[PDB]
Design a protein around this nucleic acid. Structure first.
Length: 10
DNA sequence: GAAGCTTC
DNA sequence: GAAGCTTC
């Protein structure tokens, strides 16, 4: 996740 | 180095 | 299955 807590997704 | 998960 | 970048 993220930034923060990629995406999802990318 | 490891917890921080949906989108096509 | 790839499709990903980080806060702590």
């Amino acid at each position: 996740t993220x930034p923060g807590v990629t995406x999802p997704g990318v």
